[model samples]
Target chain A: ASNFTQFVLVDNGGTGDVTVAPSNFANGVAEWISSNSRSQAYKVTASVRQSSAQNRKYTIKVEVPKVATVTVGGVELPVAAWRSYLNMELTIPIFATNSDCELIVKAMQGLLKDGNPIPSAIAANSGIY
Target chain B: SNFTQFVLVDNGGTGDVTVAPSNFANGVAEWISSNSRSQAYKVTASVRQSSAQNRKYTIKVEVPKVATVTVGGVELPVAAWRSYLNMELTIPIFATNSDCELIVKAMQGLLKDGNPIPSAIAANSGIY
Candidate 1:
């Protein structure tokens, strides 16, 4: 079965606001953001809903390419995509940028349905069709 | 340029309702529904195409307020970049909840160019 990956951003900080940069979206790749907010949590998710049925594995990675360190939900995780559905939890840290910077999360998946891992392009280019 | 699309839901029973009071552009197309004989409506527009070209597009209206539209599915409209188109669907009075499903189908102009080889084919492809 094909899998779907979603890049989610949670605003754990009480006051820090985060915004995505345009330059981050290169090569016509677009990030669609869906926002949901509650009194205790603020969630923004970007999803790549198309997965390769040929492959059975997917991983999501989050990177703060410019920052020294970033934490999610109070934990510090490496900024890389591993097994299917890569996720990280970081607490909103106090920073000097006036507002929280964007944490770029990317998704990559492998299909094992064929009994072997295949180079899957469906995750990145599914929307192109 | 920025492109956008929107869907809206309105619950009006036993009365006449106007879904959007203003013009609809690349923003969200408001859904208008009336249930006194309730109604539901959908609107769709092109903010951008998957390809840099433009092409002929069309829409299909179905029962239960469902709509399937096609654009750039056949051929990519080259020489034209970022052309915008809009549509408005209205649900007349006497529309029922059973007729409440509204959907918009979209395609990229790139699909019109030609068929590309599938790198990794997936089996039992459903919702991913």
Candidate 2:
């Protein structure tokens, strides 16, 4: 079995408190931030789970985009005017036939203004048993 | 051929620490401390280095996270968090190459918090 997870974070500093919808998942659930937070910085995470032990070999992937121009409260963090982002993708191996596999994706502060990170968000997706 | 490396620190006290343009080549190191008064601190770091070397390496260390650790003795200070390290590295390769492979290696030595985790027997895998 195989699993995948993805998430998005909105920096709520330059602007104010912002609302970011979660990404929809195919094999898993798509959870988002339904609550309002004004703690300067926040983040969200997503997760996925797979059960495979006999095989002991599976792949996992994740992706997050660094916004160029996003509105917070009314102000904009001129990110695009600045430079590039610290984006990354990871793949893990599972060498088990009947085991629990999990994947997590997140976005945090520094990506925010003043230095506040986005609230942590997570989702879970799984494959065959 | 191209090769580059970088270093940075993780301020564990409050909020997030921004990576400055000046900290491109060399960044602060993550510090560690105990108690609240005057212990220590470690800079959480993220770096990107490009090299022509073609070797299979795993996601040994990811970004937006810390890849290294520093300690004093038996005690531990504030160090970078591996929980949020994203997987991203930039390397220069030949255009003729079909694909590239990134493999994360095993922990070199002991961990600051406790005993280090065992190294992986097979850490080299390709992305093609």
Candidate 3:
């Protein structure tokens, strides 16, 4: 409701310890950045919207940077990487508890963390079990 | 504290431009450019659920048309904006919460820098 708070993403991005901090908040949205990162600093945007009179929308979008093989003046240039987004419009009509949000998010991680079927699906469009 | 969000930092050779959400509703949020207030260049994002098993998302960055009465006159916008970059999405969806979550994650992962989708997108190549 106020300033977007800072947080850490523990053991993330293949290895461990990524800290994402509030970089900017305005226009009813928030952006957090992982400043200590070497290559592309992981970036996130978060915001809430009243999608309907009966519910609210919560969105989180993360974008990673990717570099093209070719370079300008032989120097690698970074382009906007790829994206992963979370968009949920919560409707109170279902008697949905606030925790319903957690269910989706938690389920997302379960598929991606360790040896779940998600990464292959994303990286290679391979089938997920 | 609740993650509110979790992000993965990748190994690339550049910095990031942070955009904060300024307005939100109708499943759309916008970010105004900080560099120039005169032109009002901006990025907008939105999502729609088409069916019990389908969802659509979009991101667009654009600016309005501008003109002047004379060369010396101030730059002023005249019409609706055009997009510089527009990214849209319709991820596979399922009715159940767990299947839907996996579908969302997979969609995001495919978009990652190291994943297969980027090159396909940049050059208009089919994954198959």
Candidate 4:
């Protein structure tokens, strides 16, 4: 059994830390919400879910979301906007050892690391040509 | 040769990280356990500019979906399709490395093999 707790991940800009407190867990998935959420504009939704019943594949996702509000006649409404979604999926072979899985996970981090051309190229528009 | 490749293999695994770019094509690269695409990982990244000062980075990984297929009367693992996992990260074009790295690290932390996360997946126990 997995015990859920209030997960804390600190912000990098020295502004504020976002704490994701456990919200729900079922069907091989667990979800969390920002502990300091006042409005959906700044809310964070986080989750870890198993992709199938018979596989070791899992997805972990976190999002800092927002919406654009518009005034229509006499009401303010939200139009779609943007979100910062950081997500990853893991495919661990059932026969793979824990250490092997660790290596696989670390490789992903390296790919996601800053200054890694994998991400920098995407951000730098290196493919635009 | 600006691309750095992460080769994950070995019984205990030798995980490598960091990236260069385009060993074969722009914004595309391979992270492999073998030379075969039937089981190796492939990634494609592209851009969507939001403004003069902001751009969204799309990172996509194609995880090979394999099934045993018979070729010449011999059974072998073959890729039938690919399952993709994607991430979108947007920041100011001039955003400091501090900010960029923070976002990256935060997400990495979630995927870290520290405990139930990858361990659960490794153990084939999603509810763990």
Candidate 5:
């Protein structure tokens, strides 16, 4: 059972050069509950420089809806939207540095988490889990 | 920075909505760390009815080819990213009683203010 609390990253290329760890709640960049919908969001960010003047940043975000909803007959309905989400974004400078390029690759390795939660989730949906 | 909320359903179908723990746990969070990257990824849950009573729900995820980004008259290899998370659950007529009604009400409650994220990323990104 994979816990949503944290995730790890590994280089699939077998280089073993990347060095990032799963983020914990306390170390996450931001955590808060929405006042309107009461939904919750947890996020973390990482950056690397390709050169002295160029850099890139990546952000990973997780969200848990307070409630869930459905629709029937053109009318919207509600259900326990117990589903959570993991979102990612990357920002790069126009003249990026090569050093920062490896960071993005490392970040991808981290998100894959050695094929945990993501592949697990896909398996469950496919009825293969 | 702008945040987009997931949309429960904009279309109608026949099936229960389910967000697999694995998918929820693993989906969405992937980004290449580079100064030149543009990409869009999406995860979705949908429902459909095979017959009057039989229904099926599916959560599909997709990642398209990277696009190009231009800044200050300079083109970067990759420079933009966006993501979409969507869900649509349908309750069968036979099951549309009190229990189902409560579920629908819950959805309405969350969406009472409409989706904070727009249907289009252009809108969310302020390009529109």
Candidate 6:
């Protein structure tokens, strides 16, 4: 029920002449997978077109496995694993304005700040001090 | 002083371009050591509209000083840990915009979300 679907808009100084609204695709999938172990997968997509010349789109895909089984030294080890990853792809026309670029970056910053991991875990994994 | 450099670029229909630095060279290093160690913080920035024009943008970044460092599963000196994390990411201004976005997003995400050393040790192994 909880999915990553959101819209973004770029306002060209309120001129309304170059405004663009990027909406998420409804076909994107976000749900738990019960067929092969308990896992979760999500795919989110969005795009905007400012005339036939300028266009941009982005997609984020993620996969998470709650539990995993691995064979190490011929030993089948079943362990609880937090093996998850996020993959993103984007396409933007060359003529896109600077504000257009900044808008996306700003949105990304918001997402990063909102979805940060537990501080202690991060430090332990990355050797931060 | 050790520092981290984050670079960004925009490649659209017309051509490719680079985004300027939001903070000074040593700004991030100093902030992490002096301020973030006390508490966590956030960073926000914006890029210029025109690819050719260079302009100033304000940046605000904060971090909690809870982070710690380890060499080979052994805790390293906290006082000198910043240098280990010092690195750089650079690309030509003509590089792809998406690549630029990727790097900048990663840098910002790490800063905002990555756990502090002190907190991790306390949570997992108990800080001695």
> Which has the greatest DockQ?
3
Q: Give the range of the ten consecutive residues with the poorest summed lDDT in model 1 chain A.
A: A49-58
**Model 4: fraction of the reference interface contacts it also forms:** 0.00
- In terms of lDDT, model 6 sits at 0.41
Better of 1 and 3 by DockQ: 3
What is the DockQ score of candidate 4, to 2 decimals? 0.02
Residue B24 of model 6 has an lDDT of: 31
Model 6 agreement with the true structure over B8-125: per-residue lDDT tens digits? 2235644432232233321131222223233323343322211111222334443333446777898653532221222333344355789779868876665443456445654686
lDDT of 5 at A17: 34
lDDT of 2 by residue, B1-128 (tens): 01122233446656533332212122222323322322222233332222222211223222333234456554444335433333344434343433332211223233233332322213343323
Error of 4 at A104 (Å): 1.3
* Cα lDDT of model 4 by residue, A1-129, tens digit: 244677566566565666677666533356677744444533333333222222354567777666578899979966656677776666554456789878987998898788777788778867734
Model 3, residue B6: distance off in Å is 44
lDDT per model, in order? 0.30, 0.32, 0.60, 0.60, 0.44, 0.41
Q: For residues B1-128, could you state the per-residue lDDT of candidate 5 as single tens digits?
A: 11223333334555322222222112122222222324434444433333323344445554445655678887755524454445546555366579777987886675544455333443556433
lDDT of 4 by residue, B1-128 (tens): 22455432224544552232334333233344455657766665544344334566667776667789888888998888887788877777677989888988988887786756778877877763
Number of backbone collisions per candidate: 22, 58, 6, 3, 17, 25
Candidate 3 residues lying further than 4 Å off, grouped into runs, are A10-16, A36-40, A67-95, A98-101, A124-129, B1-128
lDDT of 6 by residue, A95-124 (tens): 778998999789767755634554555635
Interface RMSD of 5: 19.6
Ranked candidates, highest lDDT first: 3, 4, 5, 6, 2, 1
For every candidate in turn, the CA RMSD to the true structure comes to 24.3, 22.1, 24.3, 19.7, 25.2, 23.6
Can you tell me the CAPRI class of model 6? incorrect
What digit string (tens of lDDT, one per residue) describes model 2 on residues A44-126?
43433222211121222322333356789999753423322232323333452232232222222233334332322112233
Off by over 4 Å in 6: A1-53, A69-74, A78-94, A115-129, B1-128
